[PDB]
Amino acid sequence: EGAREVEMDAVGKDGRVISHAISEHVEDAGVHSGDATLMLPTQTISQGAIEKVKDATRKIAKAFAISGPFNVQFLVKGNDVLVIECNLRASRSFPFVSKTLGVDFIDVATKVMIGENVDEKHLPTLDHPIIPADYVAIKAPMFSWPRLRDADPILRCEMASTGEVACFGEGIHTAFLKAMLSTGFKIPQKGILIGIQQSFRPRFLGVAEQLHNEGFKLFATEATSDWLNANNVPATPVAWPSQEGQNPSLSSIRKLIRDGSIDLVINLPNNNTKFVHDNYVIRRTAVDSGIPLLTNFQVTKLFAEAVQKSRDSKSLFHYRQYS
Amino acid sequence: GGQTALNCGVELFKRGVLKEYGVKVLGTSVESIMATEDRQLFSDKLNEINEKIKSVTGWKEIEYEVVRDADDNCVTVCNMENVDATGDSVVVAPAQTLSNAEFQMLRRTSINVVRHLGIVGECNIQFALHPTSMEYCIIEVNARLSRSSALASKATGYPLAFIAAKIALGIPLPEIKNVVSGKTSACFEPSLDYMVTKIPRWDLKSVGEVMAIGRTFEESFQKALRMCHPSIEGFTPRLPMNKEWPSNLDLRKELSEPSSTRIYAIAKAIDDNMSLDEIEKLTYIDKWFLYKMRDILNMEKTLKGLNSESMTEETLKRAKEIGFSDKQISKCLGLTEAQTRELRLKKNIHPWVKQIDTLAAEYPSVTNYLYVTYNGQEHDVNFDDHGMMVLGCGPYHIGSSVEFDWCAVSSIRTLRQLGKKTVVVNCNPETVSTDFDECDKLYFEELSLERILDIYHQEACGGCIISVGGQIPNNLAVPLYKNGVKIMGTSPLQIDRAEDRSIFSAVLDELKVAQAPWKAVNTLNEALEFAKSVDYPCLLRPMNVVFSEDEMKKFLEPVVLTKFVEGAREVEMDAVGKDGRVISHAISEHVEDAGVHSGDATLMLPTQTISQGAIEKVKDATRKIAKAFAISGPFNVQFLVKGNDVLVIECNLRASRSFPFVSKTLGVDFIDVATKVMIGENVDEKHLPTLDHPIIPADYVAIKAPMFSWPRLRDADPILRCEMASTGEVACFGEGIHTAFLKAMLSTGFKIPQKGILIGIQQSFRPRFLGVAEQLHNEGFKLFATEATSDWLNANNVPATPVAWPSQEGQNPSLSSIRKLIRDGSIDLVINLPNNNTKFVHDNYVIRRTAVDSGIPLLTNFQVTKLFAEAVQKSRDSKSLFHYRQYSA
């Protein structure tokens, strides 16, 4: 629990690593690794863990006599580094890593595999990595939508996603906001629907206060709204979609999303089978109305940090040269 | 090993562990020790030989250091008299105001007490003697090495600890050699032909001490005062740090209360013509000392009436002989220090180098343990070595502790291993580096420009290292350089540039290295103008925080303002440069967010939560800085990091307190490398942690934390706030930072909490804290808090037990008291985070004080608290953490 996930993308030649790039997932390890948002270079990984990641990669490449591209995924908690798995082929992050580092990893790999000599002097080998200093890169899905496990094995609601947006920023926060804009969203500035599991309240109150201090009006289902208000974070109560008929007093989510009062939905994973349907409906509504939907806590924190640091929008892309 | 080691040994004896494993306690037996540690047993034992133990204030306090061997030979090695009125006094050795009859009566009792208790080794005994009769009593006996025993060795040249260890093997005193004379044995009592003065160093309750040697009381005493702080001129009616006396001053009140400024108050009382009898009555200081103090002030008056043409050789000679510096004299005559030195040397008035030989020259010594005095007519040594001078750190205080002792030792050793002669200068009697067996000449002397020039030019040293003794030696770089001293390594001109803020900051601009916006202000309005343009809060250097405009108003009773970003990390770069190239470096991360003082920050090495891009920027800025100041030697740069933003905070062009930590963690002595670079000795860079090939431990992390922290109340009344101060060092390795942290907690002598936690936080901090509170509770800690905070926790479904504010105990019988719960063991950890509410600053100080007095861990920072909560989650028992792990590379 609470582990970070790290991707190693590399090219081997005769069992030696002659190009590599280490990326960190924004999301804690566990929620599917294939729709994870990647940051390059790493942001919150200890230097010792990075050394272990490099060392394990060195050994793996030699044990399987690698000549060509490969990928290894790792769990990192503090200094503990655990291999999750290895794919002895190019991964979906090869293009991202290549454009970020200014070196085409597939070109290098293709050369190695056909026996065309390659000059390692300027490549990101394990001994001399390429680490962007002046910018960070983020890779996020283009589109995400919810899926209901209506098949009936378990009752749960998952996210699926597809496509790719990748952007550069001076730091990960501006890269993130650029990726949000690139996916076609407006950066929220009005109101936020907050959905969280009750057991997650202690861990969330900090971020809730922070969003409210940035000037967002907060909305939540009644018990959560009462909880926020009792902790002196102002919040407006709304109804569960399935209970719109049981209280005329409370406003409906659909209506508030339509009038533009809510322009961001945070809807974190929730195991309570009582509200899985409603949570699916809430997520579906956000997506249908074209407003950003955050379903992970680390992503949510990243967003809250990013709006704090930021302002307009044209300024983020302002004809910066990245290399 | 001090009190903790004694208690640990005694405890093992009592449990039968020493008996079970056949381990003999060497030296004084545990039975005897216990008799000296318990007041009742002590009283009982003394009554068997007609000695006894009420108020003894105003009595003279005298102590003796006694050595007794296994064959019952027993000598007194040193005696000391407290000047003022436990171990925070001005002390002189030998005692000055006793008759033979008094001295020998106490000596005799010392020896009888020491025999009756069965001391085999060293012993300290303290007496109170009635000031106008022969009545006395014994205050206490210490049967372990102490501050006093250390002071006695340094004062006499008699190596107590070494001799005590030999005695513990059953070797008698006549069979052990006196290492200073070589020709005689440990079986003798030193005769001193000089006087020693020890003065505590207070935080400007004591944090360090100085010792000075002179051949008049006045020479010794003025020297020792100067050694305390560079703003102290000697014995004068003016305060340290250039502060002026309040207009509402109650002088009699200031005299009757012991405090850190009492000595200056005495000087004022005399100067304002209060009689010495009255001063004696109020201070209990024996009038003999006050006559010497009056003589110093009369000389200041005599000097003020003179000038550079009218002052005679005789008068100047006398002034120097009673401890006047060229600086003091310059102010009286209307000259500069440098003109005064020139005038004095034109009359050929100079000091003389003498040996501390333990025997008052009864026998020739070849000792290289030296001091410098105007009271003489010849030098005791030759000046043919032309050695390399190494300057020590001066007294310990906050931000300047044992780490610089390590750096001195390494530097001195490197020189010796290269066959270079060394001259060491220091005045701190608590240091290991002031060991006359490890250097060729040791001067136990002032670290002032005047006295360093005296020694350097008399020895005709080949060079001087100023880089390994902290701030004191480094601030003398330019003055030394202008007076003919060859400084090794980075040029003094570059040191001056790097530590001039304006020039440093312009150099960073040109290099395109970012820094925290800052300004030097004069008017109060210039401060508001700056604060406006970058928002509150702001920092202040003469380091204090400023939350509002009102708060700024109070502080001016030249000042620099800086904005630190909120929520930033802080990072230290420790490095060695050679010809402007970084050939060794190490980057450490502070646990604490930037802002709370950087000198008691806990360090982690290598970094834990710093982005890779920030690390690259840190390296690049260090590369440029080293080239811009042409660095050859050690240096340090501090940075703020927020995400990818990296801002230089400052640069110190010398070794930092983290050089030992970094050296041991990386397996490379950074001081050895630096010392080699500075003297031109070639070094192989192949295996060093250069910028291009760092050394980054993979299998372990290192942590460096303070040994001891205690709270301080701003009762001075500028602001009402409670801060932490700390001293010492513990460093440990662990598989990760969490286990390193727990090992550091155990190494500092704490038990890892497992029962209950007191939670104190500012109300506005609740949203940010609730997560960690839940996490601690989920680990099985019972939570306690003051009522409103307890209610808040409970309403958020985190169980908590309410307790009372200390100031409100007995106003509610329902609520339990913190003190009681700490005593029963229900609370074994206190979290007390900074709190601005002036209503509860006093209670928060009391809570913090209670935790410290009861010996339970106290966390006062949120990041540290998070680190602890994470660490207990991961951990189990205790022996397992240190389980014979091998740490390297």
Residue numbers in the entry:
A (entry chain B): 1171 to 1481, 1484 to 1495
B (entry chain A): 509 to 561, 624 to 655, 660 to 778, 793 to 1130, 1139 to 1153, 1163 to 1481, 1484 to 1496
Q: What do the authors of the reporting publication say about this deposited model?
A:
CPS1 is a complex multidomain enzyme having two separate active centers that catalyze a three-step reaction involving two highly unstable intraenzymatic intermediates and intermediate migration between both active centers. Bicarbonate is phosphorylated by one ATP molecule (ATPA) to give carboxyphosphate, which is then attacked by ammonia, yielding carbamate, which is phosphorylated by another ATP molecule (ATPB) to produce carbamoyl phosphate. The CPS1 monomer presents the previously inferred 6-globular domain architecture, with 2-domain and 4-domain respective N- and C-terminal moieties that correspond, respectively, to the small and large subunits of bacterial CPSs (these are heterodimeric, intrinsically active and NAG-independent CPSs), with an extensive interface of ~2400 Å2 between these moieties.
